[PDB]
JSON list of N, CA and C and ligand atoms in Angstrom, two decimals:
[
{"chain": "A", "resi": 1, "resn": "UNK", "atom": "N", "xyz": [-0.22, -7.98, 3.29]},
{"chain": "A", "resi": 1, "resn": "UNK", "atom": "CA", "xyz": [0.06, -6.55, 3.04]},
{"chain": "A", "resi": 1, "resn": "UNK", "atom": "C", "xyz": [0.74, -5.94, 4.27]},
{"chain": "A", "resi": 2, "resn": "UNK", "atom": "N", "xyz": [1.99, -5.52, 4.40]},
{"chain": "A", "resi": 2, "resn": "UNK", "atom": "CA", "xyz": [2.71, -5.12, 5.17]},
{"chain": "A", "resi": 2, "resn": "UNK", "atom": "C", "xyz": [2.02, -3.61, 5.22]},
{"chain": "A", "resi": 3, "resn": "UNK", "atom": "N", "xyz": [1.96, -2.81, 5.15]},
{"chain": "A", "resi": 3, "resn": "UNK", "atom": "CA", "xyz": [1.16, -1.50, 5.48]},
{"chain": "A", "resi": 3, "resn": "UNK", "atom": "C", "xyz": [0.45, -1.33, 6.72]},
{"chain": "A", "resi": 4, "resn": "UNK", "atom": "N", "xyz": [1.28, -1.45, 7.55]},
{"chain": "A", "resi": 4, "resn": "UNK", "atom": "CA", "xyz": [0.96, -1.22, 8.97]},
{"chain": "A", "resi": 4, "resn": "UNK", "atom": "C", "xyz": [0.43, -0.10, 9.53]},
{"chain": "A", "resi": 5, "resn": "UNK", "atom": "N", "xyz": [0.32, 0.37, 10.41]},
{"chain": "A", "resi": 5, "resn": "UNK", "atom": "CA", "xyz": [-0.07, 1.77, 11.27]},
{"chain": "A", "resi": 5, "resn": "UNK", "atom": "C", "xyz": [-0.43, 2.53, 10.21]},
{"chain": "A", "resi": 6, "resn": "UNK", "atom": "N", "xyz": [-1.26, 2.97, 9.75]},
{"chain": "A", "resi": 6, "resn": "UNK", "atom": "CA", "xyz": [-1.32, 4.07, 8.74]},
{"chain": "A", "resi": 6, "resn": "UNK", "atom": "C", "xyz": [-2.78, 4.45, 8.30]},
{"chain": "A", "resi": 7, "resn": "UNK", "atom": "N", "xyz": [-3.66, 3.76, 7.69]},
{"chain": "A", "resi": 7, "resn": "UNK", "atom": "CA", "xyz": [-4.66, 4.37, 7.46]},
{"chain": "A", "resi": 7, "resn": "UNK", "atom": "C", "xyz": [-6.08, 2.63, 8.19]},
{"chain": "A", "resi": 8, "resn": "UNK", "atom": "N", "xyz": [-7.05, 3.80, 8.48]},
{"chain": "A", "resi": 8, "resn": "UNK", "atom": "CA", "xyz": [-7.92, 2.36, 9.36]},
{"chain": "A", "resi": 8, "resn": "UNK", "atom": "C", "xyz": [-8.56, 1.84, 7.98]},
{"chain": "A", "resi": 9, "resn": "UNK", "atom": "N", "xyz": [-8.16, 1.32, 7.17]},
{"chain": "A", "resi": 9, "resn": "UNK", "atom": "CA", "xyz": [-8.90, 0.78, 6.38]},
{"chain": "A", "resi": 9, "resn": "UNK", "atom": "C", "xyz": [-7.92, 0.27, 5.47]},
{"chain": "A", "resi": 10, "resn": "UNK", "atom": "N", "xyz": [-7.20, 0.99, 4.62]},
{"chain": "A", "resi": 10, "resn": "UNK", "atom": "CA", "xyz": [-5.92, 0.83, 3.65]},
{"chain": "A", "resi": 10, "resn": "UNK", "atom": "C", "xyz": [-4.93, -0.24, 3.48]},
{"chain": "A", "resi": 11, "resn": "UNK", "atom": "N", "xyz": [-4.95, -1.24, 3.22]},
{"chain": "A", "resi": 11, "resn": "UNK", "atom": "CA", "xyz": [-3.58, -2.09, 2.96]},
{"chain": "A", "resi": 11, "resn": "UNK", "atom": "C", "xyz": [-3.43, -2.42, 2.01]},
{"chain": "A", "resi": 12, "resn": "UNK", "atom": "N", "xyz": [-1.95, -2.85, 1.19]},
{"chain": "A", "resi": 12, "resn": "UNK", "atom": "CA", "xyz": [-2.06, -2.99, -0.47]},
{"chain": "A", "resi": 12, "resn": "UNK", "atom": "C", "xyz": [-0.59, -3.66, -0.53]},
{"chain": "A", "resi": 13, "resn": "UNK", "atom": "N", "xyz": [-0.27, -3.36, -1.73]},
{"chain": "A", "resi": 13, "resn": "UNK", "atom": "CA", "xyz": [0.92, -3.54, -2.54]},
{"chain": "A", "resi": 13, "resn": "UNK", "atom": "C", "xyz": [1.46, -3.21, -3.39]},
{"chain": "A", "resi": 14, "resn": "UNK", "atom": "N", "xyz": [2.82, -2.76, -3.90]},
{"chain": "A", "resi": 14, "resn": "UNK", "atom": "CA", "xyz": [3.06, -2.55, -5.48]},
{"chain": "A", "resi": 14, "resn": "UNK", "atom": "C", "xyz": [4.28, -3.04, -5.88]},
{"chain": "A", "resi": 15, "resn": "UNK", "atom": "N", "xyz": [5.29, -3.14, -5.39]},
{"chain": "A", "resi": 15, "resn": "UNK", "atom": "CA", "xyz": [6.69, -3.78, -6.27]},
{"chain": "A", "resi": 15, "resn": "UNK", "atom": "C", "xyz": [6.42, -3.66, -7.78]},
{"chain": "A", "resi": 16, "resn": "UNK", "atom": "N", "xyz": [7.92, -3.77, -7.88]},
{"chain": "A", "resi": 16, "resn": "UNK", "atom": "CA", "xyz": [8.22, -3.64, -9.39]},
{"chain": "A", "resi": 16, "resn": "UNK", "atom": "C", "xyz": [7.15, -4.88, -10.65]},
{"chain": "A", "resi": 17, "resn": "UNK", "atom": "N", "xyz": [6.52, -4.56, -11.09]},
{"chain": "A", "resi": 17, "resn": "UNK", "atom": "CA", "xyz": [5.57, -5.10, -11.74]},
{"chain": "A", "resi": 17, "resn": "UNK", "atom": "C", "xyz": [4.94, -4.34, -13.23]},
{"chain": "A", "resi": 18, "resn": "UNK", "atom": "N", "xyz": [5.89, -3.79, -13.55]},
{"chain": "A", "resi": 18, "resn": "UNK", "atom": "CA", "xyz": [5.47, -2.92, -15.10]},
{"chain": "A", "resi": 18, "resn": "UNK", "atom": "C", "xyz": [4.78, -1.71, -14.52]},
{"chain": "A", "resi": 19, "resn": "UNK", "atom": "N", "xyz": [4.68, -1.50, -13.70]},
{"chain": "A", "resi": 19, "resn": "UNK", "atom": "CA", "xyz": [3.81, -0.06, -12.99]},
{"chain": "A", "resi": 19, "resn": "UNK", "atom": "C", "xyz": [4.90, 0.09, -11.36]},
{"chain": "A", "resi": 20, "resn": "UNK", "atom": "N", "xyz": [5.81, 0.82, -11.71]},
{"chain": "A", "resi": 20, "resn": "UNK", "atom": "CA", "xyz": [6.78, 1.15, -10.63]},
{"chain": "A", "resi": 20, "resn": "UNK", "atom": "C", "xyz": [6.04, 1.94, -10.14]},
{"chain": "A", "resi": 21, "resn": "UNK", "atom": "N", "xyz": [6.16, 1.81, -8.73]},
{"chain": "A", "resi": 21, "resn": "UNK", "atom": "CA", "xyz": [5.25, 2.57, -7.58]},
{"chain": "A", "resi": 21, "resn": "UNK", "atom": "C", "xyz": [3.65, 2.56, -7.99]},
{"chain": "A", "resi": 22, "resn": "UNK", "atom": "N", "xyz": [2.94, 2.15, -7.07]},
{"chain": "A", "resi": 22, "resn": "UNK", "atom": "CA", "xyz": [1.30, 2.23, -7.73]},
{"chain": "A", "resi": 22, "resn": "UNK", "atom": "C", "xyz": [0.83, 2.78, -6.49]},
{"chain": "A", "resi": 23, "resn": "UNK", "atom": "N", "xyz": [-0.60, 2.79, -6.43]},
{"chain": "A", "resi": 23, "resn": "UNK", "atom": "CA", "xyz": [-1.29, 2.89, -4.98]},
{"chain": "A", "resi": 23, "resn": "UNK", "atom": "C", "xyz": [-0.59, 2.35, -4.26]},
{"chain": "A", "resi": 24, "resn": "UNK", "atom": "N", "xyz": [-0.22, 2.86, -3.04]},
{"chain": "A", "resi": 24, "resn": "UNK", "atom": "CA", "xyz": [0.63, 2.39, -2.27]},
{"chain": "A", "resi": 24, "resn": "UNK", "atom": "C", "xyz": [-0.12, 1.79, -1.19]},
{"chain": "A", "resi": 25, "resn": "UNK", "atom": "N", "xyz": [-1.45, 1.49, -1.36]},
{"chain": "A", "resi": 25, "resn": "UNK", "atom": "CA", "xyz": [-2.55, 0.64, -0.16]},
{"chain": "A", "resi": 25, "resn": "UNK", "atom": "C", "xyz": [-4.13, 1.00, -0.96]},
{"chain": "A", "resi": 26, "resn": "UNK", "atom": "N", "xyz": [-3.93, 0.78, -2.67]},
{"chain": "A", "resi": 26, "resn": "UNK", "atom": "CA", "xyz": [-5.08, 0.70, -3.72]},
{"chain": "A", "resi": 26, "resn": "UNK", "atom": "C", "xyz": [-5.30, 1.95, -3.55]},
{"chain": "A", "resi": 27, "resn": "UNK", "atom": "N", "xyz": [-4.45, 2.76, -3.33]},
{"chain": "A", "resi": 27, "resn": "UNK", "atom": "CA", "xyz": [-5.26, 4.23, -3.60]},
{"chain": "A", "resi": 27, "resn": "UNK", "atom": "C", "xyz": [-3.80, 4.98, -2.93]},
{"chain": "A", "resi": 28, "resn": "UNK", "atom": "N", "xyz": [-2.86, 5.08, -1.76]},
{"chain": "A", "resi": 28, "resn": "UNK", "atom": "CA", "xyz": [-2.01, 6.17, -1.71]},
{"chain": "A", "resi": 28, "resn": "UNK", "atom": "C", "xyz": [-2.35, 6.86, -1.06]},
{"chain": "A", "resi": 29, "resn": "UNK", "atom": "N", "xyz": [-3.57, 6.98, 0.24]},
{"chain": "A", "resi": 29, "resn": "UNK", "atom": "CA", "xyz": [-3.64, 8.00, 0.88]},
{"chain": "A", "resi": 29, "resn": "UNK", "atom": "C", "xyz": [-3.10, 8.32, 2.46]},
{"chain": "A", "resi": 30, "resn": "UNK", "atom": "N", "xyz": [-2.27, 9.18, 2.62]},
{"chain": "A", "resi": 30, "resn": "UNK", "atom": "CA", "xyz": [-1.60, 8.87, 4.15]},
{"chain": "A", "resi": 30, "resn": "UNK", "atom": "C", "xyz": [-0.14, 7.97, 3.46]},
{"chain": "A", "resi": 31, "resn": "UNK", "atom": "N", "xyz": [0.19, 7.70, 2.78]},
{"chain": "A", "resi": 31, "resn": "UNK", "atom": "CA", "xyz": [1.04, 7.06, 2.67]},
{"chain": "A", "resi": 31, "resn": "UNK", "atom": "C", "xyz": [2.05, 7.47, 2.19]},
{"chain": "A", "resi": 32, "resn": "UNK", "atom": "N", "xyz": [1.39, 7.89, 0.76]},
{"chain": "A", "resi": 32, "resn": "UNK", "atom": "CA", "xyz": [3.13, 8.40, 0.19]},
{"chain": "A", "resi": 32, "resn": "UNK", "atom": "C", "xyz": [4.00, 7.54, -0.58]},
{"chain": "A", "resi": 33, "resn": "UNK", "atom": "N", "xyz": [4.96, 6.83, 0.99]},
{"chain": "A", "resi": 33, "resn": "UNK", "atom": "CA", "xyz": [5.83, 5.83, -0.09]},
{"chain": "A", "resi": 33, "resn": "UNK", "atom": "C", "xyz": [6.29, 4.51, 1.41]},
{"chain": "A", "resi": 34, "resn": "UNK", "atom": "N", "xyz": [5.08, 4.62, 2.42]},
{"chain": "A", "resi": 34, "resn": "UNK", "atom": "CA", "xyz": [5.31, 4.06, 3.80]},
{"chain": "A", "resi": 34, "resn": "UNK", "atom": "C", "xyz": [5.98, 2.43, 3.08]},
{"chain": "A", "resi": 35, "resn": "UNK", "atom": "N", "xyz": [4.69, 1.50, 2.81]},
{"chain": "A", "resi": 35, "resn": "UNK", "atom": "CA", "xyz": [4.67, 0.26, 2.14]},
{"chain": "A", "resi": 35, "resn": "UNK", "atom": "C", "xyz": [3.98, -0.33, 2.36]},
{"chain": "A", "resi": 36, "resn": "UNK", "atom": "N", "xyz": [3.69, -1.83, 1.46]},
{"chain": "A", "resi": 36, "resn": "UNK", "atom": "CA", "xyz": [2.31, -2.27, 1.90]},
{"chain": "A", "resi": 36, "resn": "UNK", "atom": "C", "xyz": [2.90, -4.14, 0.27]},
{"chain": "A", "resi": 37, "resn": "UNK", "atom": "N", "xyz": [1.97, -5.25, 1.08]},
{"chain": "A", "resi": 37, "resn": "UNK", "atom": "CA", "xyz": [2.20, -6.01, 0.51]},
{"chain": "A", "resi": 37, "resn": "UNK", "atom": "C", "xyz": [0.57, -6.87, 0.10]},
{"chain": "A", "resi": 38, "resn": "UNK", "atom": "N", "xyz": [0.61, -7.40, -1.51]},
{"chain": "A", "resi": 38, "resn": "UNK", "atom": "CA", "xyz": [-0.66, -7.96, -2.17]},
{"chain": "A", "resi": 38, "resn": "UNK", "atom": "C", "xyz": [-1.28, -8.96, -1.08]},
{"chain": "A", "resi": 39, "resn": "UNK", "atom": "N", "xyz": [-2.26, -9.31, -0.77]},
{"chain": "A", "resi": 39, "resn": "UNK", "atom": "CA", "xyz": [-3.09, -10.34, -0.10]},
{"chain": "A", "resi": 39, "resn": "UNK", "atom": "C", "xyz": [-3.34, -11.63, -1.17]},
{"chain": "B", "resi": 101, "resn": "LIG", "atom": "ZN1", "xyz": [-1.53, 1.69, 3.85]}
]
């Protein structure tokens, strides 16, 4: 999960996958549209 510097807990993923844009670190908070990649 690329989602670096951003929240102390938060890392995620979403790419194009039938749900364009999702939680952007399982939830979106502090983030917005930073980025973040699946584990
Ligand atoms: Zn994040």
């Amino acid at each position: 999960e690329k989602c670096s510097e951003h929240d102390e807990r938060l890392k995620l993923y979403c790419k194009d996958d039938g749900t364009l844009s999702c939680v952007i670190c399982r939830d979106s908070l502090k983030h917005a549209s930073h980025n973040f990649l699946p584990i």
